[PDB]
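Per reviewer request, we include the raw input and output of the structure prediction for the construct analysed in the revised manuscript.
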Amino acid sequence: SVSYDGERRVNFNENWRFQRETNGSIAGAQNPGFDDSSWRKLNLPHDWSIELDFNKNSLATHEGGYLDGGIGWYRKTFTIPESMKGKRISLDFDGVYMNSTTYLNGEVLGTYPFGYNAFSYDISDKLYKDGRANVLVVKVNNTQPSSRWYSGSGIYRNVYLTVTDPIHVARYGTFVTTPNLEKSIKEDRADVNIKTKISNDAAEAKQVKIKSTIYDGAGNTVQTVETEEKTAAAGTVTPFEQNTVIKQPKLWSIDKPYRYNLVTEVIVGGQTVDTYETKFGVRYFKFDENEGFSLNGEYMKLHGVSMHHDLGALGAATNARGVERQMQIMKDMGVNAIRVTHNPASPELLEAANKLGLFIIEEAFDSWAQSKKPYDYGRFFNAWAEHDIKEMVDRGKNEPAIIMWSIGNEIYDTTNAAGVETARNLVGWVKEIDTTRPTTIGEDKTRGDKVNVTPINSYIKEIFNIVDVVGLNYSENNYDGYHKQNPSWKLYGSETSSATRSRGVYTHPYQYNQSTKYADLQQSSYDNDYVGWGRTAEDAWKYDRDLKHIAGQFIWTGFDYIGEPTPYYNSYPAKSSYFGAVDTAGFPKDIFYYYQSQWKKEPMVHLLPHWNWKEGEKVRVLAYTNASKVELVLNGESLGEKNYDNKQTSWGAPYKETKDGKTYLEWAVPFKPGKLEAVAKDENGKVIARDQVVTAGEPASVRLTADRKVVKADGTDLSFITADIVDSKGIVVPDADHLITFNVTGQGELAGVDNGNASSVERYKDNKRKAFSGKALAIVQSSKLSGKITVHASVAGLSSDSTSVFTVTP
């Protein structure tokens, strides 16, 4: 029996039964009378794939991380209270991967093929009204292979009931805009336009008004605006439109992500019968064909990353804090933009970007009608694409972080006439919902020989003219050239670099290799392993850095993700990616610091590699840094300064680079144990940053560090616990791989473990994990009881350790 205290959306994640087909088809699972009493009980969100052992024979292959999908069944038996009688009730899924069929009381509600959009079924008249039990079933069909990356399987995003009066705001029924904010801002005002759609799902017409109130971030009223009454015919939708104003508006920006909140009151016979909230931001931006990108009139480059949807040891199961953490770590790297590759975002991700200050480019599709994998969305595209792309846009049209809608990635169809037709449609469908943001596409097939300005396929060129902003994948050779040939075009790197690297691995230091495999199943962190179609981080950066018209880039990728262990194809146990600047565990690789050095003002310096080598062996030592110069000191003895030249772009923007082209500093140092220090200075010789690398002793203990010492006792919030293997002096042992055992006590539960090792096939859902390059991770989830969490860790032969996190009733 459902908990209803009058809320408009009810959390419906609890008390499901779940069972995966392992022995062929489960007869009668969709029927109300089926007996599921011995099935596992669990709460959503849930990813069934992540709980399985890695399976070298999985149909997912390396591409999908060697984790099985298949057919999964979810069942919920429930009743509706008296308090909901005569309400409208919709069952609302934020996402299910993939191809689900939903049954209610034996009847099919629907089949939903796409795995990354929200969807909804109205069930108002379909529920039994006596207090007899309803039986809801979701059959999930993730037959493989369906995906070029790890998808997860099941109901991996939240579920809700939406409960309203028969007269209500429609799904996604508000649209808030700020027209001509470019100009209106000059007189310190924002003109706010508000379009509201009201459904009448009652028997008879009714007289309806809308009261619209804007609050600021503190809760203060800013405007109130009420309409005339209006006839709302039964069984229809009736539109309302209002204009108002905000004086000295606080703008949403990357640095100051401010939002307002619109409360919409639907009023019938002097009674407010429905209430709907719309969080929104006030901001304007522009892609300019010569000057690149700006936000609120401020020129900036898009320092972007691409991100897949999994959250590491959590699998696909979404989590507000989980994504938020990913986004904070990207902010620390200097990132201001996210390409959500290659499918819509969870609500949680959107919210993270809205709250922390990140642009979003949201992409609908990884294929159109021509499949990349046999069970992907290609087979559904002609029937469903209009629906699915409109769902994306309609869902997100008020979100200030979102700045661009991408109609596809690396789409085969773009080299023929059918694909040009399809692009026209898609762009049209977008614009039926939202014309305030540019459309785009990510395109790889103009890459050519990576050197000459590739003559453009004529169909691709038609399509670049159909979208508003042109995204190039791996095609730096065309950045300037296509700009000169097509002066009206706006261009950016929609996907770049795809350099490959393992955390703490320092191999073949003086060779730059392409798509090359090693016996260790790792890749080097000297920015010297990258795929044949790509580039070093540095090289991809320079192309962008040097051109004003290039709006920016989106590297492949910000975070590692499960699957696509390129260049190790078909080499179990390589199962997860090497592309990320940060590993699946949230631990930065050295290249994170390189991006800082290029993208942030705060002075820093970062050395690599570690300082555990053989005596006399000559070590390639690098400093990533935005200082003018660095002095390197080994055991108190100077090894010399190295410096950048001050350079400028062709438009006069300064940047740092050596006489020989390097965007970092380098020494070659014969190894002597001790302490290697870097002293970063400005031109005047003044010290502005430091970093150290220190030879570690024998492993002595494990050491725990929690990322936050207080979290919410809401059953979903998370604490991330770093476990380091250290020597007796607290230095991390840089190549340590000791098995660590974790135990959680108090008001929380272990939710997963990880070390970012791409060629580990250790369980994520377990309570033990080896360190990798000295580090592992434990993720803990709070319960609904406030109190305190204690995490204990131990390693054979070393001292144990403990740390604590308080949890608080929100």
